Homo-oligomer: 249 residues x 4
């Protein structure tokens, strides 16, 4: 309670899964939240669900003009940003031999390019002492079959947390990466060819993890809140794994 | 909302520095805390500063019988442990060429051996679903002049969080390491004598860290609280660096 | 004993710097080498310096058709590949605020996209039991001012060694990253203009590294040879830092 | 061939497994080798096997006086040391609840204490520009059931490589850690309660590793040779995993 009181947050990827659970938690802690995403359907569905202190903004983070519009709205509506959660992301599986230019470009566009311009165009509004959270992944430190581009892109994300720590330290802005393991959301199964493989995919993910289950979206939200909040005021440039121990043992 | 409401915490090295700040934060978050240390005077003084919901216990973690007594007291007063913060430790500087058997044993006995037995002997009281935090250090991943044994001991600590992740996962107990950078406590002045030398040492630590300051004990406590609390319920086996970015750039 | 006797190596960016030094060492160790680069003049010059057992190939790794031609030439002349060193890359410095789409694409196209296709298109010629080395960089684990895209790209490279470990293990092909610190090549002077500025930049790099000097290209080649050779036959997926200790202390 | 020509090496743990295969390779590359260990039986068996340019020295590295005697012999016989491979080590499995003081002390004595004094007492003989290799383990970065003390001790070893890089850089002495995965030697099965579990233990180890087999002692020797040799002249403070990709994917 009150841990983000009166703070303005911007969450990309905000209309589902992790970004929605994060928006919900941020609002519970007193924040005003912008949720950003491409589908106006979900975005208003979501803003209703969250219920208070949330504005939806339609934008494709891969498009520079869409980002200019987002931040024009943030500037008009709230004046500044305290917390940026740059959370837009997407996974498509292809093995090395399967990779096509289009598959590479889609992967890097949403996971890296758009993330870079998301943060760049936030900087004029971000308050000194603000907090930026990037969504990397466990994939960024693993060797997962057919995750070639996605894992590489998520390793690039984690790298940007280090560089931006150095670049933004003079403004006391903290930049940290969160690296989720298996989280129960559409990202896990916007992949599987049926609904047969959806339950047995999660059983594998559970079996691979020390805690022995997939995480809830709310648990990832809570770790993001840690990095957003003043409780992490001496935490900078880190990679916070939230993966039930998957990468740690 | 109180994030440790009615939880029982045991903190070794809770009469000074990080451990004391953590005890104060835990009590603000509704916990009952045992603080543990060798010095009776600083224990009484710490208990008074905390002011409520605290029992001080004199125990040397390097003596097994002192641990057995600590845990009989916890058992009698509270019945079970929710959170254990194995935090006692000490730094003495010697180069490789200056190391003696006594120096080696002094460092390893409190920082590693004592920590192992602190946790082993908590196991019968730890609740399923409980949280264990070990204090490692940035030194565990650096090559600092004349910190041979201390750094090596703190790397051993970080290792044990991984092993204990694996061994305690059946009881759903999470074990995580926290690795402070420079935090403003008596530990920082381990190798200096005058007020000038101490101020100078802190200035150098500030200049070495991206955030450009020494961390406050309350900031370390807040990160420990993360790990103690339900916010980190999908976090296991990690090393959480709280060092202003020092190890991350 | 010649450690690559009669082996066929393909080196991208083999007309300058690390790639050239590696070609010379490989030829001294009995290999036949293809060096690959865009500039015809430097190719001819490099081939002459190497002096034997070398074919130079003009190819831009960022153009798929240039890779297809490279591999048709390898196929015609040698028939198969034992060692592939995907080494071409380039650094341009921009801060986050200065990044443009063009700069982003220039960095990622050669350092990541080109490297992916370089390896993908080698697969049909690579022998089972072959060795692939990727050039990452210390920048992949640091937060260096104004190296946003380059560092992120080099982290992506390191990631791909892990994925390709997993995907190519059935053919027993080893894939390893090498991560140079400061090596004395044209790459080091990417952001300077005069002879003074270059000398100064090298002095700073020397002072930053524990060994207290910039590495020679021949030292990087020797580490690549490790990874290429049978000495590293139980080494897979790694990141081999060759940086005088810079990232390790 | 000739890669350690006329160099003096000292190998602890030298009469079996990794240390013997290393002594054999070092001799093939032109070195004069001291092999050190407790059992005079094996040590002469081994020195015979190696066949040339090897002296056996009986010493228990846990005993300071035994180390003084070793280095008195090295001084008399050869005058100086070029390469030190501090390779003495031992694993006994116990879970946290099983740990006894004696089990901790045995583990830390041989893996950490003796290693520290081994290197300390070498320093007067070690040449400037010499090379020291420490045997850590994959266990030092994993969470392996019942490997509590061993893994922690091997993480302490890896730490000492960083510290000693800093302390010895002025002498241009390089210090690196090698971290073997499963290697086919008595260390693997000086553990199993029969000979039934010996073959099925190795099948598990094989199944866990990307290369899909256990390593040979000669392969670990070859990686040690890399770090001993001038091919690693710009490598300092590293952890070289030689584990068929076990820890990397
Ligand atoms: N197991 C896991 O769930 C897991 C593991 C590792 C990492 N992650 C990462 O966590 C982040 C969130 O994913 P999730 O698990 O919550 O899955 P999700 O439910 O599919 O959410 C992903 C979000 O990204 C948004 N997004 C995608 N492309 C976008 C674009 N071009 N512009 C703006 N927003 C866009 C989506 O909204 P629209 O479609 O409406 O734009 C969606 O809300 C991603 O970066 C993901 O890769 C998840
Ligand atoms: N910059 C930093 O401050 C920093 C950096 C990295 C890690 N650390 C770690 O942080 C932890 C807390 O230290 P601190 O900075 O808060 O310094 P501190 O104020 O000196 O606290 C050390 C605490 O440990 C207790 N202690 C020491 N030896 C003990 C023993 N044998 N048995 C019982 N308790 C013992 C001390 O109390 P008694 O003397 O009364 O027993 C004291 O409460 C330590 O593990 C330290 O190594 C600190
Ligand atoms: N300190 C360092 O030197 C250092 C540090 C970390 C990592 N690295 C990495 O080391 C690798 C070697 O660079 P270096 O230091 O040896 O610098 P360099 O002498 O400039 O060599 C770069 C090489 O890559 C080639 N190249 C560049 N773009 C290419 C393209 N699109 N297609 C084909 N070839 C291309 C260049 O030749 P053309 O221009 O003729 O094509 C040249 O042969 C690079 O990946 C670099 O990022 C270097
Ligand atoms: N899978 C693996 O094999 C693996 C994995 C991770 C790490 N390692 C490490 O590799 C190193 C060598 O082991 P290995 O695999 O070759 O097993 P090994 O065949 O049992 O060899 C271990 C060596 O350590 C020596 N040693 C033990 N205690 C000693 C003491 N107090 N003083 C002097 N020397 C002593 C032994 O000789 P004496 O009994 O004659 O003294 C023996 O030659 C060890 O540090 C080990 O922990 C091995
Ligand atoms: C040994 C590491 C640690 C933290 C201090 C740092 C951490 C490393 C950076 C630093 C640089 C300085 O001046 C160059 C002075 C201090 C420091 C201490 O000393 C006390 C305990 C803790 O473990
Ligand atoms: C960007 C990293 C890298 C290596 C140089 C370093 C590596 C980091 C340390 C360093 C400090 C300096 O002065 C403070 C100057 C140079 C350096 C280059 O620039 C060229 C390519 C290579 O990737």
């Amino acid at each position: 309670m009150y841990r983000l009181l009166n703070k303005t947050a911007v969450i990309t990827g905000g209309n589902s899964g992790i970004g929605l659970a994060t928006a919900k938690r941020f609002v519970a802690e007193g924040a005003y939240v912008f949720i950003v995403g491409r589908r106006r359907k979900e975005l208003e569905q979501a803003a209703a669900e969250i219920g208070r202190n949330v504005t939806a903004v339609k934008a494709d983070v891969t498009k520079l003009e869409d980002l200019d519009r987002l931040y024009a709205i943030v500037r008009e509506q709230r004046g500044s940003i305290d917390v940026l959660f740059a959370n837009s992301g997407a996974v498509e599986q292809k093995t090395l031999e399967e990779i096509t230019p289009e598959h590479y470009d889609r992967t890097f566009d949403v996971n890296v390019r758009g993330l870079i311009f998301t943060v760049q165009k936030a900087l004029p509004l971000l308050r000194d002492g603000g907090s930026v959270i990037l969504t990397s992944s466990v994939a960024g430190v693993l060797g997962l079959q057919a995750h070639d581009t996605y894992s590489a892109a998520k390793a690039a994300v984690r790298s940007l947390a280090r560089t931006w720590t150095t670049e933004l330290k003079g403004r006391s802005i903290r930049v940290n990466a969160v690296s989720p393991g298996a989280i129960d959301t559409p990202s896990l199964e916007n992949n599987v060819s049926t609904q047969e493989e959806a339950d047995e995919l999660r059983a594998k993910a559970a079996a691979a993890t020390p805690l022995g289950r997939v995480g809830r979206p709310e648990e990832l939200a809570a770790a993001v809140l840690f990095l957003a909040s003043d409780d992490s005021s001496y935490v900078a440039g880190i990679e916070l794994f939230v993966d039930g121990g998957l990468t740690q043992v």
